[PDB]
Design a protein around this ligand. Structure first.
Ligand SMILES: CCCCCCCCCCC(=O)OC[C@H](COP(=O)(O)OC[C@H](O)COP(=O)(O)OC[C@@H](COC(=O)CC)OC(=O)CCC)OC(=O)CCCCCCCC
Ligand SMILES: CCCCCCCCCCCCCCCC(=O)OC[C@H](COP(=O)([O-])OCC[N+](C)(C)C)OC(=O)CCCCCCCCCCCCCCC
Ligand SMILES: CCCCCCCCCCCCCCCCCC(=O)OC[C@H](COP(=O)(O)OCCN)OC(=O)CCCCCCCCCCCCC
Ligand code: HEM
Ligand code: HEM
Ligand code: HEM
Ligand SMILES: COc1c(O)c(C)c(C/C=C(\C)CC/C=C(\C)CC/C=C(\C)CC/C=C(\C)CC/C=C(/C)CCC=C(C)C)c(O)c1OC
Ligand SMILES: CCCCCCCCCCCCCCC(=O)OCCCOP(=O)(O)OC[C@@H](O)COP(=O)(O)OCCCOC(C)=O
Ligand SMILES: CCCCCCCCCCCCCCC(=O)O[C@H](COC(=O)CCCCCCCCCCCC)COP(=O)(O)O
Ligand SMILES: CCCCCCCCCCCCCCCCCC(=O)O[C@H](COC(=O)CCCCCC)COP(=O)(O)OCCN
Ligand SMILES: CCCCCCCCCCCCCCCCCC(=O)O[C@H](COC(=O)CCCCCC)COP(=O)(O)OCCN
Ligand SMILES: CCCCCCCCCCCCCC(=O)O[C@H](COC(=O)CCCCCCCCCCC)COP(=O)(O)O
Lengths: 54, 248, 75, 62, 93, 385
């Protein structure tokens, strides 16, 4: 569409979208893979074992 | 080598930290330090594990500042150069039970008991062997086997004759959270704990691998496409040949 | 009250049709060895028959049936 | 056959060129490979750079 | 700079192949064709055609050597048993 | 002209990685050259960042490796990238000298490329042995003993080279301290022998899997083989990232986590896998002087290969008989790795002697006879008379 003119035409704004798209991919994909890895291992982590010490 | 001189093959148990997405059981390490202290702290050093690594893994911050203040380490000497002792802190290593190697050999009939920091990575089988060693002692050895005086039999040790006597008996420890302390329950808990002591990164080595295999296999399917994109002008080239005028 | 979990399974698997057929081989060795090691002139022999091979057969059948059956019972 | 009769390219050609779209279904998949290689070359630099920082047993003696 | 010897590769323009003539090459831009148009019918039907030709040279040199290894690794465990100690004491002696 | 050809430094980048005319028909086996260039940088960048924490004394060798893996931030990443990225050095390199044997890339005019190949292959066996000896485990101490005791079989100059290598009377603190400062060095000899290896390649260009001339249809390197080499970079970084994060101690030996103790021999005293087929050759000669020579002539028999290949067509691609006997050799190099990791028992002491003869009759009997029967069968199959 007109997606090409705003984003992919100037290389100064193409690669400025790669870095602003990697700044969101760092924060989100790390939190999305941490919150899955602990949820798959619910009951084995120290944050759960510290709750059994009541 | 004979099968006796090779040791019996330690079988494949269903550990809770096998598989690629699973971590350690941090209620089986906290119950696995208690079996280390009450049973094999008598004759096994743990000289690579600092006291600070137990904080947050299986004990709190006050439970380690009251476990390191039971032992005593060498302070810097006083203003007259006399040596002196101090109670331990969070930056010290877990002290072994013997002062030197010859004191260790003298107490166990010549046999130096190995340091258990890396004993699961340094044995063929990993924790499947360290578990099955401790529960593998027969009541009486098979017929014809002449044991030397002062050597115990179990088949999982390479050679047949081991120097450690059968040590795990039922209900010899009393767990804090009310767990039935059998021989197999205790031997599973140290073998998880000795697996932690040799691999303190095993929780985080397996979740950095989940970040990397997801990125570096979606960077490989993408790079297949950009190869097939840029090579589309070469893979569909067409050559036609009509032979030129032979008068030249 | 609660006994050991692992010896609950080994006595469970030493009474099946294969466990009884393998302890009968260990009892055919360890009876042969005992009537051999009571013979005169036994200590000055070039080799003595032992039952490590029959014991390794029995101990391999047991621990391959209690390898995936054990760790659910352990809390 | 002459050299003015180009051969059959019809099995590989698109059904609609539309050069604002074909240069956007192909700069997406180049930009997506650039995005993970900038989130993947941050971690490669930050692994080696943070390796030189204050280690664990130095931080215990602070 | 200094010269060098004769090679069998030049550069762009004087590559050093034979003189070619009357061979014309057409190619379409990769922005105008669909990449990966034939991933299917090539991963199934062409990858079997490549596997039909060059598998009988990677199976018989791995069938000769793996039958040789498994017939010795099974022989090693015979003479180190209780049944084959009388064959062991004549082979090492 | 363009600035990429007019600059003094960029004209070397242009003529090597940008405008280098590669043949159009080269398959994915030609990507092993770029993988070894990547896999050399991983063994250097994760070597400098790991030698800032390594103390080289014999009392602090093994205790500082555990200091890396427990105390340094991402030390488990740095060491496992170095121990498994060195096993992946010798697996790409073994698939780079097998592409060379198969596609006939040793023949003329590329004999001066094959010879610098065998020199780089020697300095990498040397580097992976010195670096293994810097960890000072029970396989690393006792591996240095059995290897450097082999030089006490050189006649009349035997015991004075061994006692010069050791710096004493056994493998001690003078040895591990010099096996680190030597092991730091040699990857800056390999990285200056690879530049002497791309220079011998660039005068005649790469070969191609048909064995015919590639001067007709050339395509440049940039934007064609950059992005073809980027497929196997991201595949090599994927099979590495399973052997670093998910199963890191599979290729190594368990005994190497026992600290180095010179008073107890281990059960099976065996170097790391890639040096195994050069260990079943050494151990198969029932003599000490010839066993050193036959092990050293197992690398230098790679030089007689341009002069024993009697085939008039280049490469095994269009040959039937000399394609079967290639894979007889390749699955003989694998068996020879397995005899090197088994005990010296019957029948492995006879398997290792037949499978050493097949390693030394491929280059000297099987190749110059099969590649003569094939030259006659190509002739009499077409020329009717
Ligand atoms: C363990 C340590 C390893 C560390 C090194 C990591 C890299 C290992 C690379 C091994 C290798 O280079 O073998 C290449 C082999 C021969 O290539 P060829 O040119 O003859 O085939 C043309 C292909 O259709 C191009 O097809 P195309 O280029 O259009 O697609 C890209 C292709 C990339 O695949 C690969 O790179 C190899 C896996 O995408 C895929 O199809 C993957 C789909 C999941 O590729 C093949 O297609 C397999 C043919 C049989 C070879 C068996 C290999 C066993 C060792
Ligand atoms: C090395 C490991 C670290 C990698 C870090 C990568 C940093 C991000 C760069 C990736 C990227 O966004 O590349 C885009 C540009 C242009 O690459 P292109 O899309 O093929 O060019 C098209 C130009 N238009 C038509 C859009 C104007 O590409 C470039 O400007 C080339 C950058 C190449 C860096 C290597
Ligand atoms: C010191 C000296 C070092 C010597 C190195 C020793 C060997 C190291 C092992 C490296 C393995 C490399 C295998 C050979 C790779 C180069 C050969 C090759 O590229 O195979 C191509 C071959 C047929 O391809 P074509 O080129 O003939 O296609 C044209 C068709 N007209 O395709 C095929 O026929 C199938 C290829 C299948 C490869 C099988 C690899 C086996 C790997 C060993 C497995 C070990 C565990 C069992
Ligand atoms: C939970 C309890 C224990 C555990 C997990 C444990 C662990 C181990 C391990 C893994 C080995 C190595 C076996 C091998 O090298 O193959 C070993 C050997 C040894 N252990 Fe134990 N141990 C325990 C209790 C004890 C105790 C209480 C003693 C007291 C004397 C002891 C004395 C020894 C000795 C002397 C050896 C050396 C045996 C030899 O080298 O032959 N162990 N122990
Ligand atoms: C082609 C290059 C190299 C290869 C094949 C190589 C290979 C190896 C191998 C196999 C080990 C043993 C790892 C283990 O088993 O624990 C090792 C250790 C080591 N290497 Fe390298 N290495 C290379 C280059 C380098 C370089 C350039 C350095 C720079 C300082 C370096 C530093 C070390 C250190 C400090 C060790 C000991 C610590 C450890 O083992 O992790 N290496 N190397
Ligand atoms: C650090 C190790 C090495 C590096 C960086 C390296 C680098 C390269 C590169 C980049 C190429 C061009 C790509 C290709 O043709 O596949 C190449 C080609 C070649 N290499 Fe290596 N190489 C190494 C080791 C070796 C070894 C050990 C040998 C042989 C014993 C060898 C023999 C060859 C041959 C014969 C070619 C030409 C193949 C052809 O063009 O047909 N190289 N090398
Ligand atoms: C024929 O066409 C070619 C071709 O021409 C080339 C070049 C390659 C690629 C091959 C290579 C690149 C192999 C050459 C390898 C080298 C020259 C190795 C170079 C590596 C080094 C010299 C080591 C790197 C060292 C540094 C970068 C120093 C900085 C490092 C550190 C740790 C400094 C840290 C300090 C601080 C303060 C952070 C091909 O693959 C290829 O075929 C397509
Ligand atoms: C796909 C992978 C991408 C990764 C990218 C990373 C790698 C980038 C490539 C960098 C260049 C690699 C090759 C370097 C090389 O081989 O050149 C060294 C000089 C060779 O010069 P020549 O071109 O053979 O002679 C051709 C001449 O015209 C130039 O020769 P002259 O310049 O004089 O030689 C200098 C040698 C000096 O030696 C001494 C003794 O002083
Ligand atoms: C010394 C180390 C040797 C390792 C060998 C590495 C061989 C592959 C290197 C590929 C470099 C890619 C440059 C492509 C390029 O500049 O094209 C540029 C633009 O291409 C791109 O933007 C590609 C997207 C960015 C890809 C980033 C990949 C980083 C991963 C690097 C992993 C290896 C270090 C010119 O492309 P064009 O001529 O088609 O217009
Ligand atoms: C491992 C190295 C072994 C030897 C191999 C050599 C290969 C070197 C490849 C290096 C590639 C990167 C070099 C880019 C430099 C291009 C800029 C340039 O040449 O401009 C140069 C100036 O260079 C400099 O000032 C600093 C160069 C330092 C380079 C340090 C890396 C000027 O260029 P010019 O030719 O137009 O000069 C006009 C005269 N008034
Ligand atoms: C960063 C670059 C570092 C510097 C590299 C460039 C400078 C290196 C200077 C090297 C001078 C010493 C090399 C002399 C060897 C010349 C012999 C020769 O080229 O014969 C080669 C064969 O070379 C070899 O087999 C091994 C050479 C390995 C060299 C290892 C040092 C045959 O040469 P040719 O193909 O012209 O044969 C004509 C037939 N009559
Ligand atoms: C400079 C030599 C390094 C080569 C590394 C190749 C080996 C592959 C395994 C790498 C794992 C180490 C990184 C890591 O643990 O990150 C992990 C994430 O995984 C990745 O991102 C891997 C992406 C690799 C992209 C490759 C691009 C290389 C560009 C180099 C430019 C200098 C952990 O990241 P985190 O610490 O959580 O931010």
């Amino acid at each position: 569409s007109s997606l090409y003119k705003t984003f992919f035409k100037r290389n100064a704004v193409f690669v400025g979208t790669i870095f602003a798209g990697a700044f969101v991919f760092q924060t989100v994909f790390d939190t999305a893979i941490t919150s899955w890895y602990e949820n798959h291992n619910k009951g084995k982590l120290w944050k759960d074992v510290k709750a059994r010490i009541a | 080598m004979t099968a006796a001189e090779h040791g019996l093959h330690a079988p494949a148990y269903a550990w809770s930290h096998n598989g690629p997405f699973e971590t350690f059981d941090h209620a089986s390490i906290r119950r696995g330090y208690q079996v280390y202290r009450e049973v094999c702290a008598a004759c096994h050093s743990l000289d690579r594990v600092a006291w600070r690594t137990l904080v947050g893994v299986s004990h709190t911050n006050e439970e380690v500042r009251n476990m390191a203040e039971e032992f005593e380490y060498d302070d810097e000497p006083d203003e007259q150069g006399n040596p002196k002792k101090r109670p331990g802190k969070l930056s010290d290593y877990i002290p072994g039970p013997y002062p030197n190697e010859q004191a260790a050999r003298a107490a166990n009939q010549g046999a130096l008991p190995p340091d258990l920091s890396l004993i699961v990575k340094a044995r063929h089988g990993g924790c499947d062997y360290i578990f099955s060693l401790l529960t593998g002692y027969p009541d009486e050895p098979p017929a014809g086997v002449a044991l030397p005086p002062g050597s115990n039999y179990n088949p999982y040790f390479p050679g047949g004759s081991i120097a450690m006597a059968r040590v795990l008996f039922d209900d010899m420890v009393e767990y804090e959270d009310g767990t039935p302390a059998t021989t197999s329950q205790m031997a599973k808990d140290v073998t998880t704990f000795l697996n932690w002591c040799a691999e303190p990164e095993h929780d985080e080595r397996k979740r950095l691998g989940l970040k990397t295999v997801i990125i570096l296999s979606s960077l490989y399917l993408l790079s297949i496409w950009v190869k097939k994109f840029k090579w589309a002008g070469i893979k569909t080239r067409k050559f036609v040949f009509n032979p030129p005028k032979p008068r030249k | 009250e609660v006994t050991d979990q692992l010896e609950d399974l080994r006595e469970h698997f030493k009474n099946t049709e294969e466990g009884k057929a393998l302890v009968h081989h260990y009892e055919e060795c360890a009876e042969r060895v005992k009537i051999q090691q009571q013979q005169p002139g036994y200590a000055d022999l070039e080799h003595k028959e032992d039952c490590v091979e029959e014991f390794f057969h029995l101990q391999h059948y047991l621990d391959t049936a209690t390898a995936p059956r054990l760790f659910d019972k352990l809390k | 056959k002459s050299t003015y009769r180009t051969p059959n390219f019809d099995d590989v050609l698109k059904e609609n060129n539309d050069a604002d779209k074909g240069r956007s279904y192909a700069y997406f998949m180049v930009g997506a490979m650039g995005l993970l290689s900038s989130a993947g070359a941050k971690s490669t630099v930050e692994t080696f750079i943070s390796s030189m920082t204050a280690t664990a047993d130095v931080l215990a003696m602070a | 700079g200094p010269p060098s010897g004769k090679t069998y590769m030049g550069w762009w323009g004087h590559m050093g192949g034979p003189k070619q003539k009357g061979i014309t090459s057409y190619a379409v831009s990769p922005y105008a064709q669909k990449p990966l148009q034939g991933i299917f019918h090539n991963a199934v039907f062409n990858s079997f055609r490549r596997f039909k030709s060059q598998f009988l040279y990677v199976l018989i040199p791995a069938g000769i050597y793996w039958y040789w290894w498994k017939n010795g690794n099974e022989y090693n465990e015979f003479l180190y048993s209780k049944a084959g100690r009388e064959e062991l004491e004549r082979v090492n002696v | 002209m363009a600035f990429r050809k007019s600059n003094v430094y960029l004209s070397l980048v242009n003529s090597y990685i940008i405008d280098s005319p590669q043949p159009s028909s080269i398959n994915y086996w030609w990507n092993m050259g770029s993988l070894l260039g990547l896999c050399l940088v991983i063994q250097i960048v994760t070597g400098i960042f790991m030698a800032m924490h390594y103390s080289s004394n014999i009392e602090l060798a093994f205790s500082s490796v555990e200091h890396i893996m427990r105390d340094v931030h991402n030390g488990y990443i740095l060491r496992y990238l170095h121990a498994n990225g060195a096993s992946f050095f010798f697996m790409v390199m073994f698939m780079h000298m097998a592409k060379g044997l198969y596609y006939g890339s040793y023949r003329s005019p590329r004999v001066t490329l094959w010879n610098v190949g065998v020199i780089i292959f020697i300095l990498t066996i040397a580097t992976a042995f010195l670096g293994y000896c810097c960890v000072y485990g029970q396989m690393s101490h006792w591996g240095a003993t059995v290897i450097t005791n082999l030089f006490s079989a050189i006649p009349f100059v035997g015991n004075d080279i061994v006692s010069w290598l050791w710096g004493g009377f056994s493998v001690s603190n003078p040895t591990i301290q010099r096996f680190f400062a030597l092991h730091y060095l040699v990857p800056f000899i390999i990285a200056a022998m690879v530049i002497m290896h791309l220079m011998a390649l660039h005068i005649h260009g790469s070969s191609n899997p048909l064995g015919i001339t590639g001067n007709l249809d050339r395509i440049p390197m940039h934007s064609y083989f950059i992005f073809k080499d980027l497929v196997t970079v991201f595949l090599f970084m994927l099979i590495l990232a399973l052997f670093v994060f998910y199963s890191p101690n599979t290729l190594g030996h368990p005994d190497n986590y026992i600290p180095g103790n010179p008073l107890v021999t281990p059960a099976s005293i065996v170097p790391e896998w890639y040096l195994l087929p050069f260990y079943a050759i050494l151990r198969s000669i029932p003599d000490k002087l010839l066993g050193v020579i036959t092990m050293f002539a197992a690398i230098l028999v790679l030089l007689v290969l341009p002069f024993t290949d009697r085939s008039v067509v280049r490469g095994n691609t269009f040959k039937v008989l000399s394609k079967f006997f290639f894979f007889i050799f390749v699955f003989n190099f694998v068996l020879l790795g397995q005899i090197g990791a088994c005990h010296v028992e019957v029948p492995y002491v006879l398997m290792g002697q037949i499978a050493t003869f097949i390693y030394f009759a491929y280059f000297l009997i099987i190749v110059p006879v099969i590649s003569t029967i094939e030259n006659v069968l190509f002739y009499i199959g077409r020329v009717n008379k």
